Amino acid sequence: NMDGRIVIVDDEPITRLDIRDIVIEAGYEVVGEAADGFEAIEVCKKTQPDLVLMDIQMPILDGLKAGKKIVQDQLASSIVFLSAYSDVQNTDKAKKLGALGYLVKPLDEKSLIPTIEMSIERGKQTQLLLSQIDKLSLKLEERKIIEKAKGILVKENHISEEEAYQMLRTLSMNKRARMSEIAELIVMDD
Amino acid sequence: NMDGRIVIVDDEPITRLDIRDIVIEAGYEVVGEAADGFEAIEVCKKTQPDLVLMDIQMPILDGLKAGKKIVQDQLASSIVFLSAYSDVQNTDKAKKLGALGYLVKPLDEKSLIPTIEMSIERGKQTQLLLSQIDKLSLKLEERKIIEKAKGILVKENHISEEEAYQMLRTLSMNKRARMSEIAELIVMDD
Ligand SMILES: [Mg+2]
Ligand SMILES: [Mg+2]
Ligand code: NA
Ligand code: NA
Ligand code: NA
Ligand code: NA
Ligand code: NA
Ligand code: NA
Ligand code: NA
Ligand code: NA
Ligand code: NA
Ligand code: NA
Ligand code: NA
Numbered sequence: 001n002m003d004g005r006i007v008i009v010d011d012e013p014i015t016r017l018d019i020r021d022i023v024i025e026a027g028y029e030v031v032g033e034a035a036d037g038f039e040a041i042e043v044c045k046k047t048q049p050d051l052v053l054m055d056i057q058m059p060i061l062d063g064l065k066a067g068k069k070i071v072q073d074q075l076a077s078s079i080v081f082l083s084a085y086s087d088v089q090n091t092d093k094a095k096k097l098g099a100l101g102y103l104v105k106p107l108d109e110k111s112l113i114p115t116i117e118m119s120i121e122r123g124k125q126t127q128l129l130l131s132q133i134d135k136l137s138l139k140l141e142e143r144k145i146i147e148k149a150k151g152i153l154v155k156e157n158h159i160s161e162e163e164a165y166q167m168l169r170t171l172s173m174n175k176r177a178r179m180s181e182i183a184e185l186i187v188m189d190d
Numbered sequence: 191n192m193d194g195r196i197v198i199v200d201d202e203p204i205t206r207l208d209i210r211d212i213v214i215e216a217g218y219e220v221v222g223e224a225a226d227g228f229e230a231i232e233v234c235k236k237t238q239p240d241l242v243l244m245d246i247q248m249p250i251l252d253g254l255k256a257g258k259k260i261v262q263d264q265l266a267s268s269i270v271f272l273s274a275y276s277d278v279q280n281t282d283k284a285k286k287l288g289a290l291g292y293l294v295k296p297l298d299e300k301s302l303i304p305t306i307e308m309s310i311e312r313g314k315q316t317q318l319l320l321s322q323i324d325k326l327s328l329k330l331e332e333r334k335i336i337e338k339a340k341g342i343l344v345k346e347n348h349i350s351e352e353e354a355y356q357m358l359r360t361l362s363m364n365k366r367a368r369m370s371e372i373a374e375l376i377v378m379d380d
Binding site (some may be wrong): 001002081086088091092094095096099100101102103104108110111113114115117118120121122125126129130132133136137139140143160161162 | 192271276278281282284285286288289290291292293294298300301303304305307308311312315316319320322323326327329330333350351352
């Protein structure tokens with residue numbers, strides 16, 4: 001039926017069991033549970049879920065701080081908040097840390113399953129886009145630093161740009177360091 | 191008092207009015223309204239809203255097709271669906287086309303304002319990511335096509351890489367063309 005790996009985070013045990021029953025009847029896999037933010041971070045690090053269902057308010061460590069950590073280290077693909085609190089200050093924190101949904105307790109159960117589906121898909125889309133950005137940024141910066149190092153090597157040695165690139169390559173091969181690290185060493189403080 | 195520009199799309203005038211009253215009381219600007227998918231596409235193209243609230247079940251053209259069009263041509267920053275139906279086929283289509291929220295009628299009003307805040311924030315974030323990807327890709331492709339053109343000129347002319355680049359520069363400036371446009375002509379599926 002519905003596919004996804006879910007972690008449930010709430011300090012009230014019966015509320016966790018009610019949510020658990022709902023998502024298991026939908027066919028999601030509940031890969032872990034937690035009662036405070038420290039447990040939430042721990043469980044998400046181990047399980048690496050598609051989604052965290054979390055109350056913003058919990059003992060010891062609140063859900064917003066736990067969520068900030070979970071997004072920051074990408075321990076789950078998406079976070080959806082479930083809380084009795086819905087003031088603008090709490091929702092501004094939840095949206096700025098990165099949450100994909102926020103339903104207010106008592107839960108409208110019919111909305112929960114659609115919200116989970118949307119949040120899982122959007123979270124994995126976002127992870128893909130951030131990976132694209134990382135790769136593209138790396139390739140562009142490596143081209144830039146290699147170009148700058150080539151210019152420096154030409155000016156210092158009086159070689160051609162082709163010979164400078166072959167210097168960077170042969171150094172990279174023989175050392176077993178990337179040409180961008182070689183180039184950074186050539187460029188430093190210039 | 192919230193901030194955001196919203197289009198409300200529902201075939202029922204009373205439901206449009208109920209939602210309008212809620213979001214206006216919250217402080218959002220309703221920039222347009224529609225009763226079918228063709229109207230919704232047109233309104234979004236004129237208004238370019240931060241969010242469109244859309245029913246799936248509509249005559250003439252349904253919400254999923256209109257939403258797919260709105261995402262494809264970036265006519266709104268986010269879509270949230272509002273349907274009496276919550277089945278897996280409708281939710282699969284909504285998530286794949288790229289919706290950020292799906293909520294199920296009759297509306298749990300207390301969730302609506304939080305879901306709007308999340309969806310607007312996530313939509314603006316995603317547009318930033320997509321913009322960064324396009325900028326990085328264009329810069330990288332310009333570098334790549336110039337590199338390819340330089341190597342072609344070197345091999346045909348038997349000039350140095352430096353002289354090849356100055357050829358591309360001189361052509362670009364004399365023709366008042368982008369150097370990538372010149373390089374595209376030099377490469378011409380070589
Ligand atoms: Mg609590
Ligand atoms: Mg309808
Ligand atoms: Na289970
Ligand atoms: Na993750
Ligand atoms: Na904040
Ligand atoms: Na997304
Ligand atoms: Na990421
Ligand atoms: Na150079
Ligand atoms: Na409704
Ligand atoms: Na953002
Ligand atoms: Na592009
Ligand atoms: Na050059
Ligand atoms: Na340009």
